[PDB]
Design a protein around this ligand. Structure first.
Ligand SMILES: *[C@@H]1O[C@H](CO)[C@@H](O[C@@H]2O[C@H](CO)[C@@H](O)[C@H](O)[C@H]2NC(C)=O)[C@H](O)[C@H]1NC(C)=O
Ligand SMILES: *[C@@H]1O[C@H](CO)[C@@H](O[C@@H]2O[C@H](CO)[C@@H](O)[C@H](O)[C@H]2NC(C)=O)[C@H](O)[C@H]1NC(C)=O
Ligand SMILES: *[C@@H]1O[C@H](CO)[C@@H](O[C@@H]2O[C@H](CO)[C@@H](O)[C@H](O)[C@H]2NC(C)=O)[C@H](O)[C@H]1NC(C)=O
Lengths: 109, 49
């Protein structure tokens, strides 16, 4: 878990090999690339309440808002189970208006 | 670990608070107090040196 201890980047495993008077480690490491650009926001205001992401981050390609994990890109629609509410949003800086979908209501129809 | 990835500072402090167990909800509601704490502490250490 300590960074740069074994390899450059995130670590997966290693294999040892012998030598005349030493040892040789082959480290397998994970490295990301082929980035993108996105517009973010630290919270979401809806129905007078503030919603924060459980684990992830908010992104937007201009007209829609999604939640994705930090180290990879896989958009998901903002439900009400992967986000948790905390108080009202009049003191947070950077809030953005939007709507948050919920699963129970369509299934009750 | 690779190529530098830009990130706003507050959303980095939120990750660093998540790293120690305190939920990120704490930081966004106490940002000004933490900023003042940081500035005062750095001023005090400058004076001490
Ligand atoms: C942002 O991404 C969304 C998701 O792909 C785009 O919205 C969809 O666009 C497709 C066709 O381009 C439609 O069939 C879908 O109905 C749209 N909505 C959804 C929820 O998928 C949107 O056009 C993108 N916007 C920009 C500016 O790139
Ligand atoms: C990101 O930064 C920009 C500029 O630094 C902010 O835009 C400013 O918003 C305030 C309102 O709070 C205005 O009084 C300023 O005139 C704006 N600046 C400019 C250059 O137009 C923007 O609000 C910041 N975004 C967040 C989420 O904090
Ligand atoms: C998000 O929506 C809220 C509520 O609709 C906006 O706040 C109101 O904006 C109107 C017109 O701009 C004002 O007359 C009200 O006084 C505002 N407050 C309330 C409680 O209604 C807000 O401007 C929208 N945008 C953002 C960035 O929050």
């Amino acid at each position: 878990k300590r960074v740069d201890f074994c390899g450059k980047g995130y670590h997966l495993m290693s294999f040892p090999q012998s030598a005349p008077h030493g040892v040789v480690f082959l480290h397998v490491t994970y490295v990301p690339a082929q980035e993108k650009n996105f517009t973010t926001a630290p919270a979401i205001c809806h129905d007078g309440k503030a919603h924060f992401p459980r684990e992830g981050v908010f992104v937007s390609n201009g007209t829609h808002w999604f939640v994705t994990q930090r180290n990879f890109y896989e958009p998901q629609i903002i439900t009400t189970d992967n986000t948790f509410v905390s108080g009202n949003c009049d003191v947070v800086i950077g809030i953005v208006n939007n709507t948050v979908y919920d699963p129970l209501q369509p299934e009750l129809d | 670990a690779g190529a530098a990835l830009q990130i706003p500072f507050a959303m980095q402090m939120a990750y660093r608070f998540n790293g120690i167990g305190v939920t990120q909800n704490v930081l966004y509601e106490n940002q000004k107090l933490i900023a003042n704490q940081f500035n005062s502490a750095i001023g005090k250490i400058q004076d001490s040196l």
